[PDB]
Amino acid sequence: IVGGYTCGANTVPYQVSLNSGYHFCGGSLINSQWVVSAAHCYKSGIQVRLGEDNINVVEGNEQFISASKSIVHPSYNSNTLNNDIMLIKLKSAASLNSRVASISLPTSCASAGTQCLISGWGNTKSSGTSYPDVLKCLKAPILSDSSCKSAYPGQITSNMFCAGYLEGGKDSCQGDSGGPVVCSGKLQGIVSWGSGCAQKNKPGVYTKVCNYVSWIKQTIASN
Ligand SMILES: [Ca+2]
């Protein structure tokens, strides 16, 4: 997260870190046994880390649970990033508490102008590299479809939205991928892609979760 703030320990209780020896992506806990992330975060050997603040220090609220199954969206296209969503099932159910909690799926899609909370352990610099140990947060509005498409001609599908600031300076970045965009207490986005980070006229692009609620629910119901 570039241009954000330190969230505070365990203040984003649905935020998970995906670990394969190291943090490599975010995700969102949606019930005691399932996480939503980005398909472009797929790999084998995932351990889901819940209850994290400092990802390099055991602070006492963590739960580390291996993935038993990963399910990339049936229509994910890694070239266009259309349908950039995956589900991860945990080998055991997380113990839910005030610091480890699920985030509701959206009943309805969100509109441009709605404020959201974007979070992660990604790079905090737009030029160069600095990775935080503690969770970072950014408040950002959803941008209109027309301004998203104008920023990225020929690239924005109906399964994507932009959020952030056209002036630059505030954005998600490398290592935030797969993490949450939460608006009015609902998971509306997944950190997906953008050109660089925090550049003028290049806001972040996010997977539009409301399009996937039916698939999420039916996948959970049979897996
Ligand atoms: Ca920790």
mmCIF file of all heavy atoms in Angstrom, residues 14-44:
data_model
loop_
_atom_site.group_PDB
_atom_site.id
_atom_site.type_symbol
_atom_site.label_atom_id
_atom_site.label_comp_id
_atom_site.label_asym_id
_atom_site.label_seq_id
_atom_site.Cartn_x
_atom_site.Cartn_y
_atom_site.Cartn_z
ATOM 1 N N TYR A 14 -10.500 -9.864 8.991
ATOM 2 C CA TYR A 14 -10.686 -10.744 7.848
ATOM 3 C C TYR A 14 -9.467 -10.796 6.930
ATOM 4 O O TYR A 14 -9.443 -11.601 6.004
ATOM 5 C CB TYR A 14 -11.937 -10.300 7.050
ATOM 6 C CG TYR A 14 -11.900 -8.827 6.697
ATOM 7 C CD1 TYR A 14 -11.219 -8.364 5.591
ATOM 8 C CD2 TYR A 14 -12.525 -7.897 7.509
ATOM 9 C CE1 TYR A 14 -11.147 -7.014 5.300
ATOM 10 C CE2 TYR A 14 -12.455 -6.536 7.240
ATOM 11 C CZ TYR A 14 -11.759 -6.094 6.134
ATOM 12 O OH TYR A 14 -11.685 -4.732 5.891
ATOM 13 N N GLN A 15 -8.476 -9.929 7.142
ATOM 14 C CA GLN A 15 -7.289 -9.929 6.303
ATOM 15 C C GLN A 15 -6.414 -11.127 6.606
ATOM 16 O O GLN A 15 -6.037 -11.333 7.771
ATOM 17 C CB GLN A 15 -6.483 -8.646 6.545
ATOM 18 C CG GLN A 15 -5.120 -8.623 5.851
ATOM 19 C CD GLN A 15 -5.158 -8.165 4.408
ATOM 20 O OE1 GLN A 15 -5.663 -7.085 4.111
ATOM 21 N NE2 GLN A 15 -4.573 -8.945 3.510
ATOM 22 N N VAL A 16 -6.062 -11.905 5.583
ATOM 23 C CA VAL A 16 -5.101 -12.987 5.769
ATOM 24 C C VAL A 16 -3.869 -12.716 4.906
ATOM 25 O O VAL A 16 -3.916 -11.990 3.902
ATOM 26 C CB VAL A 16 -5.683 -14.402 5.499
ATOM 27 C CG1 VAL A 16 -6.972 -14.637 6.303
ATOM 28 C CG2 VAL A 16 -5.892 -14.623 4.014
ATOM 29 N N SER A 17 -2.758 -13.316 5.332
ATOM 30 C CA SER A 17 -1.521 -13.401 4.580
ATOM 31 C C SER A 17 -1.377 -14.821 4.048
ATOM 32 O O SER A 17 -1.510 -15.778 4.813
ATOM 33 C CB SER A 17 -0.316 -13.063 5.467
ATOM 34 O OG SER A 17 0.911 -13.381 4.823
ATOM 35 N N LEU A 18 -1.130 -14.948 2.751
ATOM 36 C CA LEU A 18 -0.816 -16.232 2.145
ATOM 37 C C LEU A 18 0.695 -16.407 2.172
ATOM 38 O O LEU A 18 1.427 -15.524 1.703
ATOM 39 C CB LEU A 18 -1.353 -16.331 0.718
ATOM 40 C CG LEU A 18 -2.850 -16.078 0.556
ATOM 41 C CD1 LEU A 18 -3.245 -16.279 -0.910
ATOM 42 C CD2 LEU A 18 -3.683 -16.937 1.457
ATOM 43 N N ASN A 19 1.157 -17.533 2.732
ATOM 44 C CA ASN A 19 2.575 -17.748 2.999
ATOM 45 C C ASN A 19 3.030 -19.047 2.352
ATOM 46 O O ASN A 19 2.412 -20.100 2.530
ATOM 47 C CB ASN A 19 2.779 -17.800 4.519
ATOM 48 C CG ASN A 19 4.237 -17.931 4.912
ATOM 49 O OD1 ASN A 19 4.842 -18.995 4.768
ATOM 50 N ND2 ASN A 19 4.801 -16.858 5.425
ATOM 51 N N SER A 20 4.129 -18.978 1.604
ATOM 52 C CA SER A 20 4.769 -20.164 1.025
ATOM 53 C C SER A 20 6.250 -20.182 1.386
ATOM 54 O O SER A 20 7.117 -20.406 0.543
ATOM 55 C CB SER A 20 4.577 -20.207 -0.483
ATOM 56 O OG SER A 20 5.193 -19.099 -1.111
ATOM 57 N N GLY A 21 6.547 -19.917 2.645
ATOM 58 C CA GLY A 21 7.897 -19.638 3.124
ATOM 59 C C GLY A 21 8.126 -18.178 3.436
ATOM 60 O O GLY A 21 9.134 -17.817 4.053
ATOM 61 N N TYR A 22 7.206 -17.331 2.995
ATOM 62 C CA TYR A 22 7.255 -15.879 3.012
ATOM 63 C C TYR A 22 5.855 -15.419 2.604
ATOM 64 O O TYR A 22 5.129 -16.136 1.888
ATOM 65 C CB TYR A 22 8.302 -15.313 2.009
ATOM 66 C CG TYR A 22 8.219 -16.029 0.686
ATOM 67 C CD1 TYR A 22 7.340 -15.630 -0.298
ATOM 68 C CD2 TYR A 22 8.994 -17.166 0.440
ATOM 69 C CE1 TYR A 22 7.206 -16.351 -1.460
ATOM 70 C CE2 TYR A 22 8.872 -17.874 -0.722
ATOM 71 C CZ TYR A 22 7.961 -17.478 -1.666
ATOM 72 O OH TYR A 22 7.789 -18.175 -2.836
ATOM 73 N N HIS A 23 5.496 -14.204 3.028
ATOM 74 C CA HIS A 23 4.265 -13.585 2.531
ATOM 75 C C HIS A 23 4.356 -13.351 1.035
ATOM 76 O O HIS A 23 5.333 -12.779 0.576
ATOM 77 C CB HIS A 23 4.084 -12.230 3.230
ATOM 78 C CG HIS A 23 3.016 -11.397 2.614
ATOM 79 N ND1 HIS A 23 1.680 -11.556 2.909
ATOM 80 C CD2 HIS A 23 3.106 -10.474 1.626
ATOM 81 C CE1 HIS A 23 1.001 -10.723 2.135
ATOM 82 N NE2 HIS A 23 1.840 -10.059 1.353
ATOM 83 N N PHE A 24 3.322 -13.750 0.286
ATOM 84 C CA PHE A 24 3.322 -13.436 -1.138
ATOM 85 C C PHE A 24 2.024 -12.831 -1.662
ATOM 86 O O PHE A 24 1.992 -12.357 -2.802
ATOM 87 C CB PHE A 24 3.676 -14.666 -1.992
ATOM 88 C CG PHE A 24 2.644 -15.737 -1.975
ATOM 89 C CD1 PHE A 24 1.612 -15.750 -2.935
ATOM 90 C CD2 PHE A 24 2.672 -16.757 -1.021
ATOM 91 C CE1 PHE A 24 0.637 -16.735 -2.889
ATOM 92 C CE2 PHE A 24 1.689 -17.724 -0.986
ATOM 93 C CZ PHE A 24 0.671 -17.726 -1.932
ATOM 94 N N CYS A 25 0.947 -12.857 -0.910
ATOM 95 C CA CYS A 25 -0.326 -12.304 -1.375
ATOM 96 C C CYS A 25 -1.218 -12.142 -0.161
ATOM 97 O O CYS A 25 -1.025 -12.801 0.864
ATOM 98 C CB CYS A 25 -1.056 -13.221 -2.392
ATOM 99 S SG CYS A 25 -0.637 -12.991 -4.125
ATOM 100 N N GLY A 26 -2.226 -11.286 -0.297
ATOM 101 C CA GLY A 26 -3.295 -11.213 0.668
ATOM 102 C C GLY A 26 -4.467 -12.118 0.299
ATOM 103 O O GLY A 26 -4.496 -12.775 -0.740
ATOM 104 N N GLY A 27 -5.463 -12.097 1.177
ATOM 105 C CA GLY A 27 -6.728 -12.778 0.972
ATOM 106 C C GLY A 27 -7.698 -12.302 2.034
ATOM 107 O O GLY A 27 -7.329 -11.547 2.939
ATOM 108 N N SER A 28 -8.938 -12.773 1.930
ATOM 109 C CA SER A 28 -10.015 -12.380 2.833
ATOM 110 C C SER A 28 -10.732 -13.629 3.338
ATOM 111 O O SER A 28 -11.141 -14.484 2.541
ATOM 112 C CB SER A 28 -11.026 -11.498 2.110
ATOM 113 O OG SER A 28 -10.437 -10.329 1.612
ATOM 114 N N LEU A 29 -10.895 -13.726 4.641
ATOM 115 C CA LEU A 29 -11.626 -14.831 5.254
ATOM 116 C C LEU A 29 -13.115 -14.587 5.080
ATOM 117 O O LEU A 29 -13.618 -13.560 5.523
ATOM 118 C CB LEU A 29 -11.280 -14.893 6.739
ATOM 119 C CG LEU A 29 -11.787 -16.120 7.499
ATOM 120 C CD1 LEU A 29 -11.114 -17.397 6.995
ATOM 121 C CD2 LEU A 29 -11.542 -15.918 8.997
ATOM 122 N N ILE A 30 -13.824 -15.512 4.439
ATOM 123 C CA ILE A 30 -15.250 -15.331 4.184
ATOM 124 C C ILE A 30 -16.142 -16.278 4.994
ATOM 125 O O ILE A 30 -17.346 -16.033 5.093
ATOM 126 C CB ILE A 30 -15.605 -15.328 2.685
ATOM 127 C CG1 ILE A 30 -15.225 -16.650 2.055
ATOM 128 C CG2 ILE A 30 -15.012 -14.112 1.968
ATOM 129 C CD1 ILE A 30 -15.955 -16.895 0.746
ATOM 130 N N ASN A 31 -15.592 -17.330 5.576
ATOM 131 C CA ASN A 31 -16.245 -18.125 6.615
ATOM 132 C C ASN A 31 -15.120 -18.842 7.359
ATOM 133 O O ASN A 31 -13.944 -18.601 7.075
ATOM 134 C CB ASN A 31 -17.395 -18.999 6.071
ATOM 135 C CG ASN A 31 -16.923 -20.147 5.204
ATOM 136 O OD1 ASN A 31 -15.771 -20.565 5.283
ATOM 137 N ND2 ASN A 31 -17.830 -20.688 4.393
ATOM 138 N N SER A 32 -15.459 -19.719 8.308
ATOM 139 C CA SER A 32 -14.411 -20.327 9.112
ATOM 140 C C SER A 32 -13.466 -21.210 8.317
ATOM 141 O O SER A 32 -12.373 -21.511 8.816
ATOM 142 C CB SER A 32 -15.017 -21.142 10.256
ATOM 143 O OG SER A 32 -15.704 -22.257 9.740
ATOM 144 N N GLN A 33 -13.827 -21.605 7.102
ATOM 145 C CA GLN A 33 -12.975 -22.548 6.399
ATOM 146 C C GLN A 33 -12.637 -22.152 4.968
ATOM 147 O O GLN A 33 -12.059 -22.972 4.243
ATOM 148 C CB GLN A 33 -13.593 -23.950 6.479
ATOM 149 C CG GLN A 33 -12.569 -25.000 6.356
ATOM 150 C CD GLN A 33 -13.022 -26.329 6.908
ATOM 151 O OE1 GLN A 33 -14.154 -26.486 7.410
ATOM 152 N NE2 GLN A 33 -12.137 -27.319 6.814
ATOM 153 N N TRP A 34 -12.943 -20.920 4.567
ATOM 154 C CA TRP A 34 -12.690 -20.494 3.194
ATOM 155 C C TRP A 34 -12.153 -19.073 3.135
ATOM 156 O O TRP A 34 -12.635 -18.168 3.834
ATOM 157 C CB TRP A 34 -13.972 -20.561 2.358
ATOM 158 C CG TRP A 34 -14.435 -21.953 2.044
ATOM 159 C CD1 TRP A 34 -15.265 -22.751 2.791
ATOM 160 C CD2 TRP A 34 -14.081 -22.718 0.882
ATOM 161 N NE1 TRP A 34 -15.463 -23.947 2.149
ATOM 162 C CE2 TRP A 34 -14.758 -23.944 0.974
ATOM 163 C CE3 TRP A 34 -13.278 -22.479 -0.241
ATOM 164 C CZ2 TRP A 34 -14.663 -24.921 -0.027
ATOM 165 C CZ3 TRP A 34 -13.180 -23.437 -1.214
ATOM 166 C CH2 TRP A 34 -13.872 -24.644 -1.111
ATOM 167 N N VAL A 35 -11.189 -18.901 2.234
ATOM 168 C CA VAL A 35 -10.569 -17.626 1.907
ATOM 169 C C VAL A 35 -10.783 -17.314 0.433
ATOM 170 O O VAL A 35 -10.691 -18.207 -0.413
ATOM 171 C CB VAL A 35 -9.063 -17.717 2.234
ATOM 172 C CG1 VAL A 35 -8.247 -16.575 1.625
ATOM 173 C CG2 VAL A 35 -8.876 -17.751 3.758
ATOM 174 N N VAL A 36 -11.057 -16.022 0.135
ATOM 175 C CA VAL A 36 -11.087 -15.459 -1.222
ATOM 176 C C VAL A 36 -9.756 -14.753 -1.480
ATOM 177 O O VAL A 36 -9.274 -13.976 -0.639
ATOM 178 C CB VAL A 36 -12.273 -14.477 -1.411
ATOM 179 C CG1 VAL A 36 -12.153 -13.616 -2.714
ATOM 180 C CG2 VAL A 36 -13.605 -15.214 -1.363
ATOM 181 N N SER A 37 -9.179 -14.987 -2.657
ATOM 182 C CA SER A 37 -7.995 -14.247 -3.073
ATOM 183 C C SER A 37 -8.059 -14.064 -4.587
ATOM 184 O O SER A 37 -9.100 -14.288 -5.220
ATOM 185 C CB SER A 37 -6.745 -15.002 -2.596
ATOM 186 O OG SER A 37 -5.549 -14.282 -2.844
ATOM 187 N N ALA A 38 -6.946 -13.597 -5.172
ATOM 188 C CA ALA A 38 -6.834 -13.426 -6.617
ATOM 189 C C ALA A 38 -6.327 -14.722 -7.243
ATOM 190 O O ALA A 38 -5.439 -15.376 -6.697
ATOM 191 C CB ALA A 38 -5.868 -12.291 -6.950
ATOM 192 N N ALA A 39 -6.860 -15.084 -8.418
ATOM 193 C CA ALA A 39 -6.331 -16.221 -9.156
ATOM 194 C C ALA A 39 -4.861 -16.067 -9.505
ATOM 195 O O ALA A 39 -4.136 -17.071 -9.570
ATOM 196 C CB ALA A 39 -7.141 -16.441 -10.434
ATOM 197 N N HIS A 40 -4.400 -14.837 -9.736
ATOM 198 C CA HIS A 40 -3.001 -14.686 -10.096
ATOM 199 C C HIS A 40 -2.064 -14.963 -8.912
ATOM 200 O O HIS A 40 -0.857 -15.085 -9.118
ATOM 201 C CB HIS A 40 -2.735 -13.348 -10.806
ATOM 202 C CG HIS A 40 -2.516 -12.194 -9.899
ATOM 203 N ND1 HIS A 40 -3.482 -11.250 -9.616
ATOM 204 C CD2 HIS A 40 -1.402 -11.818 -9.230
ATOM 205 C CE1 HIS A 40 -2.947 -10.319 -8.835
ATOM 206 N NE2 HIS A 40 -1.693 -10.652 -8.575
ATOM 207 N N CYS A 41 -2.617 -15.137 -7.707
ATOM 208 C CA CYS A 41 -1.887 -15.577 -6.525
ATOM 209 C C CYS A 41 -1.785 -17.098 -6.411
ATOM 210 O O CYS A 41 -1.156 -17.583 -5.478
ATOM 211 C CB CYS A 41 -2.567 -15.039 -5.256
ATOM 212 S SG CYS A 41 -2.458 -13.248 -5.047
ATOM 213 N N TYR A 42 -2.384 -17.855 -7.311
ATOM 214 C CA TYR A 42 -2.336 -19.307 -7.213
ATOM 215 C C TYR A 42 -0.890 -19.816 -7.159
ATOM 216 O O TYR A 42 -0.036 -19.435 -7.967
ATOM 217 C CB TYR A 42 -3.075 -19.951 -8.422
ATOM 218 C CG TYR A 42 -2.750 -21.422 -8.521
ATOM 219 C CD1 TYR A 42 -3.312 -22.374 -7.681
ATOM 220 C CD2 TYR A 42 -1.746 -21.837 -9.372
ATOM 221 C CE1 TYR A 42 -2.870 -23.741 -7.698
ATOM 222 C CE2 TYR A 42 -1.297 -23.164 -9.388
ATOM 223 C CZ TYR A 42 -1.871 -24.085 -8.559
ATOM 224 O OH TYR A 42 -1.392 -25.367 -8.589
ATOM 225 N N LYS A 43 -0.665 -20.762 -6.265
ATOM 226 C CA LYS A 43 0.517 -21.625 -6.270
ATOM 227 C C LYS A 43 0.195 -22.790 -5.352
ATOM 228 O O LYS A 43 -0.803 -22.774 -4.633
ATOM 229 C CB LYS A 43 1.775 -20.886 -5.824
ATOM 230 C CG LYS A 43 1.616 -20.407 -4.431
ATOM 231 C CD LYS A 43 2.890 -19.986 -3.788
ATOM 232 C CE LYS A 43 3.436 -18.766 -4.422
ATOM 233 N NZ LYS A 43 4.873 -18.438 -3.909
ATOM 234 N N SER A 44 1.050 -23.808 -5.402
ATOM 235 C CA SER A 44 0.993 -24.882 -4.416
ATOM 236 C C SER A 44 1.672 -24.460 -3.108
ATOM 237 O O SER A 44 2.388 -23.454 -3.031
ATOM 238 C CB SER A 44 1.662 -26.142 -4.958
ATOM 239 O OG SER A 44 3.012 -25.876 -5.260
#
